[PDB]
């Protein structure tokens, strides 16, 4: 996995997720400082089906294609994100995603959230509910 530095004004990108929007600015900031910048090229896979899911990607730019087991394929572009199912399923994800064009993503992980969202008991109580 890549761990490059991130661009400015990524707060809104992270807060694009309803959960992270409900999360306090203090936690979002922490996510940003732990935010991993990953670059991907056409044909590259980001998440594969049957692998342990525990991360989410926000799309800075480019086009990706998400395919879910037994479900209609959906494509995403600049300003979108994926990994909702990845986080939802704590075990092996039943979906995959690959890049259709040159793209760049912002990566957050549950391991990071164990430092962010489990930073305060007040958010630990909620995190226990979060899948």
Swiss-Prot record:
It comes from the Eukaryota. 3',5'-cyclic AMP binds at residues 83-84, 86, 93-94, 97. Highly expressed in thalamus, testis and in heart, both in ventricle and atrium. Detected at much lower levels in amygdala, substantia nigra, cerebellum and hippocampus. Coiled coil: none annotated. Belongs to the potassium channel HCN family. Homotetramer. The channel assemble into homotetramers or heteromeric complexes that contains of four pore-forming subunits. Interacts with PEX5L with a 4:4 HCN4:PEX5L stoichiometry; reduces the effects of cAMP on the voltage-dependence and rate of activation. Interacts with IRAG1; regulates HCN4 channel activity. Interacts with IRAG2; regulates HCN4 channel activity. This is Potassium/sodium hyperpolarization-activated cyclic nucleotide-gated channel 4. The lineage of its organism: Eukaryota, Metazoa, Chordata, Craniata, Vertebrata.
């Amino acid at each position: 996995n890549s761990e490059e530095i991130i661009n400015f004004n990524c707060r809104k990108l992270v807060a694009s997720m309803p959960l992270f929007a409900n999360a306090d600015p203090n936690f979002v900031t922490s996510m940003l400082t732990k935010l991993r910048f990953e670059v991907f090229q056409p044909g590259d896979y980001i998440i594969r089906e049957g692998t342990i899911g525990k991360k989410m990607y926000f799309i800075q730019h480019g086009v990706v294609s998400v395919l879910t087991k037994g479900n209609k394929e959906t494509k995403l572009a600049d300003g979108s994100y994926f990994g909702e199912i990845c986080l939802l399923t704590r075990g092996r994800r039943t979906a995959s995603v690959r890049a259709d064009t040159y793209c760049r993503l912002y990566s957050l992980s549950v391991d990071n959230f164990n430092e962010v969202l489990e930073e305060y008991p007040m958010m630990r109580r909620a995190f226990e509910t979060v899948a």
